[PDB]
Design a protein around this nucleic acid. Structure first.
Ligand code: PUY
Ligand code: PUY
Lengths: 276, 276
DNA sequence: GACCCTCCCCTTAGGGGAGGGTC
DNA sequence: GACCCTCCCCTTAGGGGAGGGTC
């Protein structure tokens, strides 16, 4: 009333740290009514305390300080609108988070499917849900010369729309009595798509399609070069043996087991193909 | 394949800024396979490119870099769990935002009611919805000696639970044939409560109650000292004139018109009282 | 003994840009 | 001509703490 609060007294009173008050002073956001000209001590009036209501509420909303100065000024009608602004900045973040949560939940669903493989290196025929994908012509690439850079573009499209990177790298090819890896080419390469955020500015050299619901002969294993062809060969036999009728390319997918560079590179591979 | 990508080549390929790559190198998060010992030029292999999938996905989730190093290591089963962690950190933020949005939307509703006052300095009798509040005994305070610091405690309780600060400061008192402000004391002071976040560790010297749904004689005006008592007096007359029967304390509330300290302090005041 | 001062140094994740030396 | 290097300086909102001088 007829004396000043000292910075401590205010901080205790306002639930705002002493160092915060100095900062708000420094940046001319909230400043001592008085400053002792000899002790540099900061003194505060009871009535000026009200300005903190705004500063604190805003801070809690996460409005940045420089923005708060602009806000101090407005009278209610104008400050109402400011609030709407935050409200719409907040609906934005939520939308982005709900999206994010749904994505993770899917990435986790795809991951579970992996560690719940029925067995490795053995051929299992299973009933599968469809996996939306985007893909591009493999332009004379096969298993032998295909690089990560090959996927630069697909990834760039899925990143813009999903913000997550495909954990996994796919290619497809013709099911054929292959006698040598030497003699395979990929028809397409591709990656799976996770969200249904309409993908911006997609180009006519990318096709969006899916690996369709249906019965599949799969085999999966942890990659090493020797095994690659031989597992494929196993599949081929599996189908021939059962006189089974194939109805798609062979799809393959490659997933890293880890991303550490302190450990040896390791991948899970899975090969599948649709059958009647 | 049999040569290196240069930092530019990678950045273009990976949609990750050149300066970012240098940073990830600096902090041993992602590091050139090779560094030319004479040009300090950073060279990268096509296969190491995969580690970026994780870095980028994570970054997008907003996982902090130092955390990413820990994450690189885990094999799927362990990294699954990491994801759950984020998922639960995200459900947290949403909960906090939905809460935040609902609060703002209320603060805005209270604000509209203000600028849609029927008129100022005139007594209007209106049908009101209830306002939950928390309050404390005014310990011999009246209009003359009441300070902001008086509300230190209420505010501290509502801040912990709402995170917003009451825009408005309330007191109540006995409706009485007052002939002088000199002769009033507040029964309680109080502030309105916004959220229904259970308020932690509330103490027995605070009562939670509401200003109840009902018919009210109100007057509201922009404060100045002369007007304060005289408006009160008007209310008193209003009731006497209509032979109206009061059924509560007089409630008053004070709201700032602005929070700028570049402008003169200004408050809206409103006084009301419940009637049959 | 307690409180307040000023003035270091520190933290995230790079972007901008200057002032080289390389492809 | 283009690309890459290292090494300034900069940004949010203070917290920690040292090394005073004040209540
Ligand atoms: C690992 O990062 C990649 C690299 C390339 C791809 C593209 C493709 N899906 C694909 O077929 N990716 C797989 C493999 O086909 C291919 N690969 C690399 N080396 C060989 C090889 N020898 C060296 C004898 N024989 C057969 N395949 C080979 O590399 C990938 C596993 O490293 C996917 C992931
Ligand atoms: C503004 O910040 C405050 C300060 C105190 C309060 C407490 C209380 N609700 C209350 O009655 N707050 C109101 C007013 O009652 C009181 N007030 C301040 N000065 C006077 C006065 N004279 C100086 C003659 N006469 C009557 N009332 C006065 O200050 C507040 C408006 O400034 C609320 C807001």
């Amino acid at each position: 009333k007829e004396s000043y609060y000292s910075i401590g007294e205010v901080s205790k009173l306002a639930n705002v740290s002493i160092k915060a008050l100095r900062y708000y002073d420094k940046i001319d956001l909230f400043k001592p009514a008085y400053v002792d000209p000899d002790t540099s001590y900061r003194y505060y009036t009871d009535s000026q305390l009200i300005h903190l209501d705004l500063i604190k509420s805003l801070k809690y909303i996460g409005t940045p300080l420089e923005e708060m100065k602009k806000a101090q000024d407005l009278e209610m009608e104008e400050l109402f609108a400011f609030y709407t602004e935050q409200e719409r900045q907040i609906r934005e973040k939520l939308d982005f988070l709900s999206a994010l949560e749904q994505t993770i939940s899917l990435v986790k669903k795809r991951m579970k499917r992996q560690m719940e493989y029925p067995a490795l290196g053995e051929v299992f025929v299973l009933d599968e849900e469809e996996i939306r994908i985007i893909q591009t012509e493999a332009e004379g690439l096969g298993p032998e010369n295909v690089l990560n850079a090959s996927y630069s573009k697909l990834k760039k499209f899925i990143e813009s729309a999903d913000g997550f990177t495909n954990n996994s790298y796919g290619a497809t090819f013709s099911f054929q009595p292959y006698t040598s890896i030497d003699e395979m080419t990929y028809r397409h390469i591709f990656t799976p798509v996770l969200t249904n955020k309409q993908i911006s500015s997609i180009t006519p050299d990318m096709e969006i399609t899916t690996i369709p619901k249906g019965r599949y002969a799969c085999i999966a294993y942890n990659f090493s070069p020797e095994h690659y062809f031989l597992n494929l060969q196993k599949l081929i036999k599996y189908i021939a043996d059962r006189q089974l009728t194939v109805v798609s390319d062979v799809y393959e997918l490659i997933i890293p087991i880890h991303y550490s560079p302190k450990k040896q590179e390791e991948y899970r591979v899975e090969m599948k193909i649709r059958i009647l």
